[PDB]
C-alpha cells in the first residue's frame, strides 16, 4: 500500500496473508474454512496465515493452517487477468473471534463514489521495493467506468472496476495482491493489477466481486 497508514493490530479481521516461506499475496476470510484471493496468485505450498499484524513476529493471536486445495476460476486468462479469482479451502476451520473473523460477499455490486477500504502488507513505495512488518491501510473510491476505461482504454472487462487516485500519490501495489477492497462491510473487490503503482491517472483495477456470489457460493457448496 502506498500512501497509505498502518491499520493497527486486528482491526482488519479478515485480512489473511499467503506464505509459501515469505508473505506473497492477501486473501479475505468468507467463513470459518474458505478464502477468496487472486487467481495470479495461485501456487502450490500455501499456507494460510490468520489474525496476522507484523507478518515477521509471533504476536500472538495468529493461525497457520495449510490450504487444502485452491481452486483457481475455470475461466481465468493470465494474459488479460480477466476472472483473477481464486477460492482457497483450509485444511482445518480457523477459530473465529474478534480478531480473526470473515467479511461478507456482497447482495449488490457498489457505485462509483463508494469509498472502500483496502488492506495489505505489499510495497509502500512507488519507484523502488519497500515492504512492511505490519498491515497497511487505505481508503479510496470505487472510480466511474469512464474513468476507468479512459485510463486503461481496452484492458477492463465487466468484471473489473478501477479504484483509487487520479493524482497519484495513494494505491495499492505488488504483495496486496489478492487482498480485499471492502465498502460498507461487503467484499466488494479483489487486488488485481494495474500499471506501477501510485503513478498518475493509473489508478489500481480490482476483481468486481459481485459478478461471481453465485459461483463462489455453488463451488462451496459443491467441495
Ligand atoms: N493498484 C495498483 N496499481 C496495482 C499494482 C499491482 C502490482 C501487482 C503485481 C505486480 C507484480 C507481481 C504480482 O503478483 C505476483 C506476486 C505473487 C504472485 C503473482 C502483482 O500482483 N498487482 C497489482 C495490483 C494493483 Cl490493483
Ligand atoms: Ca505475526
Same mark, same amino acid.
Given at each position: ?87 482457497? /479451502? !483450509?485444511?482445518?476451520?480457523? &477459530?473465529?473471534? *474478534?480478531?480473526? @473473523?470473515?467479511?461478507?460477499? #456482497? ?78 462491510? /461487503? !467484499?466488494?473487490?479483489?487486488? &488485481?493489477?494495474? *500499471?506501477?503503482? @501510485?503513478?498518475?491517472?493509473? #489508478? ?20
Amino acid at each position: 500500500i502506498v500512501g497509505g497508514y498502518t491499520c493497527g493490530a486486528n482491526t482488519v479481521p479478515y485480512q489473511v496473508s499467503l506464505n509459501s516461506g515469505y508473505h506473497f499475496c492477501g486473501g479475505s476470510l468468507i467463513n470459518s474454512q474458505w478464502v477468496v484471493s487472486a487467481a495470479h496468485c495461485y501456487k502450490s505450498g500455501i499456507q494460510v496465515r490468520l489474525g496476522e499484524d507484523n507478518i515477521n513476529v509471533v504476536e500472538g493471536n495468529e493461525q497457520f493452517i495449510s490450504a487444502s486445495k485452491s481452486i483457481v476460476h475455470p475461466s481465468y486468462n493470465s494474459n488479460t487477468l480477466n476472472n483473477d479469482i481464486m477460492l482457497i /479451502k !483450509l485444511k482445518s476451520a480457523a &477459530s473465529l473471534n *474478534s480478531r480473526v @473473523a470473515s467479511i461478507s460477499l #456482497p447482495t449488490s455490486c457498489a457505485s462509483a463514489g463508494t469509498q472502500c477500504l483496502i488492506s495489505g502488507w505489499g510495497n509502500t513505495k512507488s519507484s523502488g521495493t519497500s515492504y512492511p512488518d505490519v498491515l497497511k491501510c487505505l481508503k479510496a473510491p470505487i472510480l466511474s467506468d469512464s474513468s476507468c476505461k479512459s485510463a486503461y482504454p481496452g484492458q477492463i472487462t465487466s468484471n473489473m472496476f478501477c479504484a483509487g487516485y487520479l493524482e497519484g500519490g495513494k494505491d495499492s501495489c505488488q504483495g496486496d495482491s489478492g487482498g480485499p477492497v471492502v465498502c460498507s462491510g /461487503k !467484499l466488494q473487490g479483489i487486488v &488485481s493489477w494495474g *500499471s506501477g503503482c @501510485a503513478q498518475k491517472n493509473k #489508478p489500481g483495477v480490482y476483481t468486481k466481486v459481485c459478478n461471481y456470489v453465485s459461483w463462489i457460493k455453488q463451488t462451496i457448496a459443491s467441495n
